[PDB]
Structure formats: structure tokens, C-alpha cells
Amino acid sequence: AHVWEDNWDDDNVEDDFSNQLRAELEKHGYKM
Amino acid sequence: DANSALMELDKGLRSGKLGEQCEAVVRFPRLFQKYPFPILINSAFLKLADVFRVGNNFLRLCVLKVTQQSEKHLEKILNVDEFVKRIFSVIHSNDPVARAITLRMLGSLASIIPERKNAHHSIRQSLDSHDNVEVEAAVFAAANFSAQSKDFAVGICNKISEMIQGLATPVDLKLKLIPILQHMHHDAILASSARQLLQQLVTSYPSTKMVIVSLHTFTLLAASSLVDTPKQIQLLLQYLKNDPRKAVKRLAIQDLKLLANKTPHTWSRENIQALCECALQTPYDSLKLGMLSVLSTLSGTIAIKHYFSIVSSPRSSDLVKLAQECCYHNNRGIAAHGVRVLTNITVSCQEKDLLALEQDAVFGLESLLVLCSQDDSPGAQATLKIALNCMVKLAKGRPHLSQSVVETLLTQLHSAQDAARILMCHCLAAIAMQLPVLGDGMLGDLMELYKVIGRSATDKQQELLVSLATVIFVASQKALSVESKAVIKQQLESVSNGWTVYRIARQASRMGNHDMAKELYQSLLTQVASEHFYFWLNSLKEFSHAEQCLTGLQEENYSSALSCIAESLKFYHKGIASLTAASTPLNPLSFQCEFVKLRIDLLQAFSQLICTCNSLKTSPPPAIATTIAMTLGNDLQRCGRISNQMKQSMEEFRSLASRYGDLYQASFDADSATLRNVELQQQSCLLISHAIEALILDPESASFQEYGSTGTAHADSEYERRMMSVYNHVLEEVESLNRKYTPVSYMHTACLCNAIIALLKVPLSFQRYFFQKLQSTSIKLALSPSPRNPAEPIAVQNNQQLALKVEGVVQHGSKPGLFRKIQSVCLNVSSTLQSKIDNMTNEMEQRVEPHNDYFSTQFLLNFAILGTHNITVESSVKDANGIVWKTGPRTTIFVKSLEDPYSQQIRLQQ
């Protein structure tokens, strides 16, 4: 089993919506 | 079209070239998985049997592989006797290759013909023919028929015993012949005869290559026919103790692992003791590792209670010494399994002398922490994750050692080389998620590691940044320091991805640090790229800002509280507008919008209630005393327009609680934490309802005391514990103040205001289903009446009946059983008179159980009414343990209703 079950921070678990957000925001890659 | 594909593939079959014949033959399985129609399946299979009876042996191998691929459609075959007659009729050929291929196909047809005596006989004869390739094909065919039959199995066990004693055929063919005895789990006497045969086999052939397959078939036989598990275990322990072959001992390892994983409760105390003695007496680190893995699995299971069940000290028990010495052994994996055994036994059993074992286990635990922290190997990280599992399990099972283990993990956070830090950050996040004091105990050092991050890491900076920001929020569950968040912003603006800082922001929204959340959402809002993304980030920003305003609250000041409520409600209004802007036909934020709307309505109800609480003193008792006599009040005992508004608020709050129950039962897809959180919000609403009902309204009729268990720390969140403590406080205060005053509500308004202030002082917890959603399950639910392509109503003669033929197919976005597995579908259909008792007579529901992911059900409706009717259906998906879970489309169909002219004329004559 994994170390922590309520893990929001994992790659393959996350769904289509903020996958698209991930694509955009990794393309952006900065904050002011 | 399906028929068209069928006979064009038939023409490809009738083509001259065997290449094109192979083309069509291997093209059938696509047609099977496209058209599941059974007549088509039967005709295609019949043409297959024809071409297999007359093909040129490569077509035969192609047809064989087609059957072996599309095996699952075999059960819907009608003309079984003709199919089997062709396929069996080609077995009399003199070509050994053709005989072998045919026997393999019979092994494939085992699913539909398990009783064919002639097939049994042909397999048994070709089993002792001489042609090699058909001998091994006969072995494979026996291996399938013995799985799906019984009398064939007893025939084959007699024949196999005869052959093995009869000493013909070489050792390789003996290896092929042994694994037939796995399918002897049909009866106990067959199992015993095969067991005697296998014991004789191992004693007759002391060879490694013999013994390995013999033992593995013997143990699968016992694990299937679980009657001789103790004999199996003691035989394996004998061979692990006695036989000096290292490979055979590794077989014993990988087999006792299987038995320990399958049937743990059958493990006995003498078995455990014998394995422990073997693990002490072994010289080899690898075999000791395997035995320790076996003991780790058994310790995780129930059998530790068997080993420490009395009717010999626990210290006198040989397990403890082995566990201690192997936990302090030099080798890393051995130490990992030792600390696994120690953690399991410590959490499981509670005897008086085990405190020394607790101390030894925790100290050897930071030994594993330092070793895996500065090892940096893949196996080292595996043992590290094992140690962190030991941490989570030990701390949750026993809260006694929590502060010690947290401070040790912080010392390792000092002493780590920036690879294991993410892992132990997750682990200590879990531990502080259980017990809150672990963060505000040592806020400083985690911030020090945070400031050394930037020049400490170069490869997984994003990952460790996200983890340590999560735990800094968990540590500063209280109001976050401006200097600390400025340092956080400094490092994030130094080096971060937008997706990274977004994940820090999401963790901030999860824990409740809404000021930091507001800042991060503001930055991400100012960048974004796309429109629904912008509106989504903007809505999140507004809820974070409103929650910041709500946390900006002062105790026992009602005017400032309602001002803060109004400000926060303005900001939720902006946020919910932007959320409706973010809403799209794809990925529709239904749960998010509905949940934030219910939170809005809860806060509006709170503001209205505290407004009426303040207006309690607006001469309502004077209005009552002016309208009627104060003594023996006609409207109520100490009557009040304020009491009327209390009744209105009570009914409104109960309706709000009903809406929360509706939201939860329509959601159904979230995990345990989110569903629990929604239950707590409904708990708060019902708490306010019961408080205003049992204190302002009739307390003698209330007569309710919370004479039940409450306040246990079995919760899954510190947030949940905080709301639960608030609930206990409100219950004790209302139970104290139930009978003290008259209904004039002197300090009753003060008690209600205190409850409101506490319930708003506990901030919020934005949650996972409000964020990333998983196990997206749906019901298509296509009805099939007379097809109404437009909204034109469907005419029925109204004298006979009407049939519906509803159909549903269930779909899953991922692994369907993440949290809840669908079990049954309660469909619910009712009628309504479209032209205005609302046609609520037919109130049908039916519990169809989807055996496969498609289902259909026939409904009959009776009606004799002139007007149009609307027909409504519901899915009512009910899960494994049994819950309502109202999801589904809830579609509606219009139906017309006309009558016979002869019937109308007869009614006119009537």
C-alpha cells in the first residue's frame, strides 16, 4: 500500500479536467 | 450490414488462396466482438467447423487461435452436436500435427462440451500414443477437461498413476504430465488418492526438477481442495527444514507466502514455532528474508492472536527473539521485515510485558529511517516505504508513541539527503492529520527545511515543495503567519511551476488556509489561458476570500459577526456567479455549484436567525401582551411573532437538511472523507434545527437528553473532531438550559448565538470531490417505447395496456470499484396527468440486477384517461452494502391517449 491514502498529489489518479489545466499550466510554468 | 460482413467473409473463405482464407478466418473475432447476435455466432461457428474439417493445416491452426481468442462467446452456440461432430470427425486423420491441433481445439471447447465420452476416450488414447507433438497436445487437452469435469478427472488420475509408475516416457514428459493433478479439487477421496500419489512421487524421484513442480501442483491442489492444509503445511516445513537444496527452499518460501496470503486462520502455533526455529537456524540471508516476509504476512493477519492465545511467557516465545535480532540485523531488507513484524505484533496484541518491545521497535525504527534515508537505492526506497507503513499503522493503532515518532521523523528531516523527504513528509502529514499537536509543537524546523529547499534540490523540487507546503498548512492549521507565508511566496516566486503552486493552493483549500489560498488563486487568475479555467480559478478565489473574511471573526460580538457574514456572502455571490460561468456541458460542476449554493443558504439562514435573535427584544412580548392577556396567553405561553419566526426558521433549517441529504445521495461518487464532510454539514444543520426546536419550542414535549456515546476520537479529520466537539458543547449547553427559563427566551438567544459563533469559528474544509473526481459512473437509461423522435405524444388505444421496455447500460470512467461497486438498479416509474390525484396510481418500482453491464426490464402501464400523460423513470442505483443513492437521468416520455370511435359511440348511447 502507499504511504498516505488521502493523497491528492499523484499524477495518474487525477482526471481529465485538470489534466487539461495541467497541460496549459505546465506550458505556462511561472507565477509572478 | 452484419449479414453482409458474414457472407463476404464466407466468400473470402471460399477463395482459392490459403492466405485469403487465413485472412477471413482471423477476421472472425472482430466480428464476434462487434455483433453479439447469437444466430450470427452459430452460423459463423458452423462455417469455421466446415473449414477446419477441410483445411490445409495452417487454416486449422488459424481457426484454433480464433477459438482460443474469442472463447467468451462460446456459451451461445446452438448446433453443438454438429459443430462437435465436424471437429471430432477430423481426429481420425493419420497426420500427427492435425491430431494435435484437433486435440488443442477440444481443450478449447472444454467450456461447452465437458461430458463428451468419445472426446474423453480419444484424449486418453492419444495420451499414450507415441507421436510427441500430439502427446503434449493431449496433455493440454486433459488439463482443460480435468478442470471442467470430474469423472474424466478420476479416469485421468488412474491413468497418470499407471503411467508414472509404468516408467515409460522421459522426465520432460513427466514434467508435462504432473500439473494435471491441480484439478482434483472435485472430491475429497480423489484429493486423498492424488495426495498419496504425490507423496509417493516426491519420495520416488528425489530430483530438484521433479520436486519443484510436484510441490507446486500439490500445494495448488490443497489450496483449492482446502481439506489437508495442515498436512500440506507440515510437509512444506519438513522440506524447508530438511532438504539442503537452496532452490527448493526458495520454492518453500514462495509457496508458504501463497498459503499465508490465502488461508491465514488455518495457520497453527506449532507451524509458526517450527518456521521460527528454521528462520533462526538458517545461515543464508536470502532465505531468512523469505521466511521473514512469510512471518510479516502472518503477523499482519489474525494468526498472531493464535500464537499468543493462552490455553510460556510471550518473551519466552521464540518469535520475539527472532524478530528482535532480525530487526537489528545488518541487512536492510531483513531489518525492514523485522520492524514489520514488531509493528504488527505491537498494534495487534496488548499484554503487560510488550512495552519493552514497543521501545525496541521504535528505536530500531529510526535505525531503519537513518539507513534508508542515506542509502538511496530503489530497494532502499521500497524498504523506506515499508517503514513508513509501519509508522502510519503504529501511530494510528497506538496514539501513545506519537510525539516520540514525530520528533524522530523531524530529526530525520534534518538529516536527510532530499530523496526520502517527500515520503516521510507524506507519512508525517498522515500522523499530524490524525493528531493535531505535532505541527504547532515544532512549526520552526519544517520552515527551516522549507527555506533550505531552494538550494537543496534540483530534480523533484516541485514534488518536495508540494509535500512540505501541505505539511506546513497541516502544522499551521491555525491562522497562518504573514512572515511565514511571505517566505513561502518568496520561494514559490523564485522557482515553481504554475501547476505546482496550484497544487499548494489546492492543499491550502483542503486544510483551510484561505488567505494563502486567496493569494495563490489571485496569481493564477492573473495568468491562466482559457475561459472556463479562468472562471473556475476566479470562483475559487472568491470562496477563499469569503472564508478569510469568515475566519476574521470575534467571539461574542453579534453585530460584527453579522457584518462579516454579509461580506462573506457577497463574496460567495460573486464566486457562485463565476462558477456558473465556468459551468460547461462537458465536465459539469453539478456537485460544486450545488454544494456551494447549500453553504450559501446555510449562512443566509444563520444570518436570518441571528437577526431574529437580535430582534427578540423588538417588543414581541409587548405585542403579545397588547393583543391578548399575558397571563394564559392565547397564541402561546409567552407568545411571540418572534416565536412564529422561530417556527419559520426551524422549518427552513429542516428543509435545508433535507437538501443536504439529497445532495449526498445524488453525489454517491465521492470518497469516504468527502461523504463524511457532507454528513457533518447536514449534522450542523440538524443540530441547529434540534436546538431551536427543543429550546424555543416546547421543552416538556422535547424531553430529550443525549444519553448515548459521543466524543470518541474515531474521526478521520481534525476538522471533523472540531465540529464534533462543538456539537458536544452545544448539546451539553442545551441540556443544561432545557428547563431553566420560560419560553420568553432570556438567555436562549445567547445560547443559540454561542452555537452560531462556534459553528462559524470552525472555518470549512474544501474537499476532494469538490476537486478532482474519480469513479465517474453513469447510467444511460434509454427507454424504448414507440419511438418519439420529436416531442409528439404516443397514442395508445387506452383499452388494453401499454408496454415500456426500458433499458440501461452502466459506464465507468476508470476502474469501477474504486469506492462503491454497483450491485442492483431499482428503477422507479410513475405517471402524471399532463392535462390538468395527479395520476399517482401507478407507482411502480422494480429491482433489476445487472448480471452484465446491460439490462432491460418490461413495464406495464394502465390508464383510461382522455388527457396527455407524462411518464417518469428513475435509476435508484443501490450499491453492495445497500444504500439508496438517487442518481440517474430521470427522463420523461409524453404519452397520448385516444379511444375507439365505437367505444365513444357506445358511451354516447349509454
Added chain:
Amino acid sequence: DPSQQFLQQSLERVYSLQHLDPQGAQELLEFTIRDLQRLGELQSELAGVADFSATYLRCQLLLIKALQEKLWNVAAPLYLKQSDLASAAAKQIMEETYKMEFMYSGVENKQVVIIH
């Protein structure tokens, strides 16, 4: 009689290992339930008694789950909704006791008073 001996051994194992944690009771009950179900499929003349003791253990596990439900942890006046696995357990356990009394052929008054 290896099958009868094994059935007796498993039942006395449960009876002796009664005095432990509710969780461990849950896993032991589940394991023995699927075990005796496997035996009832496996043999024929022990199938009835195996299934009878198996549904009795299912009865007991159902009642223990109903007791270990978190409704007792949560305070009394709430009782929200849909957590009534206890109530569904009560209905199923009553139906199983009726089934266990009447559908079986050989029952004697010791078993009957246990049923009641």
C-alpha cells in the same frame, strides 16, 4: 471423516477465538464463512450442515457489524439518514432466522431455541 473433522475444527476455532477484537472477529467470521461455503460446494452430504452453520455465522457477523456501526459513536439526537445498515441488518437477520428455522429439514429443539 476428514471433512466432518475439519468442519468441527473450524467451528470450535471460532467458538474459542470469540474473545478478541471486533475487527478480528469480522475477518475471522468472513474467512470461515467463505470456507464453509466452499466445503458445501465441495461435498454433498455435508453441504446442508455446512450451509446451515455458514448462514448462522453470517447472521452473527451481520449483528456484529450492526453493533460496530458508527451510529453509536455519533450522538443520539441526530440519526441522519441512510447509515441504517443496522436496520437493513435487522431485516436480513430476521429473514435469515426464519429461513434457518423452516427451509431446513432436520432441526431439533436445541437448535430451535438457539434460533428463537
